[PDB]
Specification:
This is PUA domain-containing protein. This protein is of the alpha+beta class and about 170 residues long. The protein has 6 helices and 11 strands.
Amino acid sequence: IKHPLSKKDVKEIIAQLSQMFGEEIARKMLNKKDEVKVAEFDKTTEIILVNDKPMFIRRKDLIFPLVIALYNLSDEEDLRKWPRRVVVDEGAVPHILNGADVMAPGIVDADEGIKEGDFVFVVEEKYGRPLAIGIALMSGKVMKEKNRGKAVKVIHHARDKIWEVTA
């Protein structure tokens, strides 16, 4: 069941998105006048809907765009040049879509603004289709420099159960 999100919570989501993506990208994802609702996926995971479209994952009080939301955006913008991006080669794709974390050897580019602990999204270098979202285990700079080590802890990927119910 969908419960309305408070104005205070809406403003905090906007604040989070603005910090992560900049005010311009954030503004198209959510504005302070939108009807925002929350649905439960499971006991640690919520789905935030903006005017009835699934837009964000929420884990406790922290949000990030869903893979479906980024997928739709990838038909408008080239996500290969976005903040919080982790760009992977074609060899990395099937592993990630099967639930694997992102390994440094498969990363072809990353936002240098990324710090360890940051929410990131993962996109493949051809169509810039998003594959996953997760938590950076390396800085963006380190992701570009290293060809060894785990780079991103994936928390949601295309083809997973969240994808099934949001896509």
